[PDB]
Every structure is written in C-alpha cells, then in structure tokens.
Amino acid sequence: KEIMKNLYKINLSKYINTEDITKSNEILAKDYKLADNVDVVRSKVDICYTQCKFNECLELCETVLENDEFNTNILPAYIGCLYELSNKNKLFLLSHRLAETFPKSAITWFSVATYYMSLDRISEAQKYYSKSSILDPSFAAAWLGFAHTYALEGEQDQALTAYSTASRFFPGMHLPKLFLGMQFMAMNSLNLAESYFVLAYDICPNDPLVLNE
C-alpha cells in the first residue's frame, strides 16, 4: 500500500491540490526508481499543461514519445501543446503516421483536424472533427474543437449548440463552459457570460484565459 497509494494518488485531477501531486512525484522518483515510468511523465506533463507550461510539455513529451510514439494517453496533451506552439511540421508528421497506424481511432482524426486548424483550413477541420467526435462520444477535445471550427468559420448559431452539447455531456469540465462564454462575448450577450465565467473561475483561480476573459 505504501507505493500503490501514491500511484493511485498520481492519477487524480490536477486543478486542485496540485502541490501534493508534485510531492508524490518526487516520492515516486526517490526510493523506487520510477522516474522513468511513463505515467509519472504523463502526470508531470499534465501538471505542466495545467498552468500552460507548453514548452515543458513539448520537451518532456518529446523525451517520452521517442521511446514510444503511440501511447494514446500521452498523445492528446502533445497535440494541445503543439497547437499552442503553433507548429505544423511535427504535428503533420505525427498525424500522418498515426493515420496509417490507427485508422479507426478518433485520436488520429482529431490530430488531423488540429493540423488543419493550425493551417487555418476550417472547412476540412469541420469534417475531420466531426468524424473524431462520432468515433468517440467521450472525447471532449472533439466537441470543443468542433465548436472552435464553427466559431472561426464565421457562423456561430451552430457553435452555440455545439458548446452546449459539450458542456452537458461532460459535467464538471470548465473549458467547454469557458469557451461557450467567449462565444457569448462574440454575440454581445454578457448576461449569461457572467454566470458562466463565474462558474469557470470557481475552479480555475490562476490561468491566463479566465482572467483575460
């Protein structure tokens, strides 16, 4: 139990009680030679992603991906911090390799849609997020990227329903609600935006997007 308690503690959510997750990370790193463990690296990557350490996301996930390039748990965070770094060649390579590796996984189609978003081809990203969403009904990135495609396309009425769907399917996820509130700004409807942003800020006290909004 001395080790498995910590191992289970690693896998909880990262927004709250962040420091204890860190101390558990050094606890595993010491006395157990598990610093090389893949899931320890995954936890550290998610720590870095939470406060938006996207450069550290890139470096750590590149170190882990060299050993294994198809860890499905690792990959979505790497897509996120790659699109944040706004680079198309490496996203492009990984997406085209995953397409021929795992044709039936929504992960690769999500990566393709992200690549098209990075290339600002909204029309194709529409379909390539729709396919990823259809493949995995439990894939929040799919719905939020879908509504991102809607919002960046020019039309927003369907983006409203999309963000509402993403919010309702996944209760307790602040990001769909936050993006829906950004859209409310886009329609100049601030009255719902106040409540939605308060709800999002209830669990995200320190992140640039919330405070900027």
Binding site: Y49, P76, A77, G80, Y83, E84, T114, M117, A140, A141, L144, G145, H148, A151, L175, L178, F179, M182, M185, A186, P208, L209, N212, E213
Partner: peptide, 30 residues
C-alpha cells in the same frame, strides 16, 4: 486541449471620432 484564441480589444471608430473632434475644438480654443 484546444485552447480558444483569447478575445482581443478593438479600437472603435466612435472613440477616435470623439478624440479628433475634441482635438478640433482644442486647436480652435486658442
């Protein structure tokens, strides 16, 4: 996660019109 592009503030035409007008009466003052 696909982070949304943060919204950016724009310089409106009404405020710049107000400022250029105020400058017009400012130079008309003396």
């Amino acid at each position: 996660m696909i982070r949304r592009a943060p919204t950016t503030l724009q310089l409106s035409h009404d405020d710049v019109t107000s400022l250029i007008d105020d400058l017009n009466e400012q130079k008309l003052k003396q």
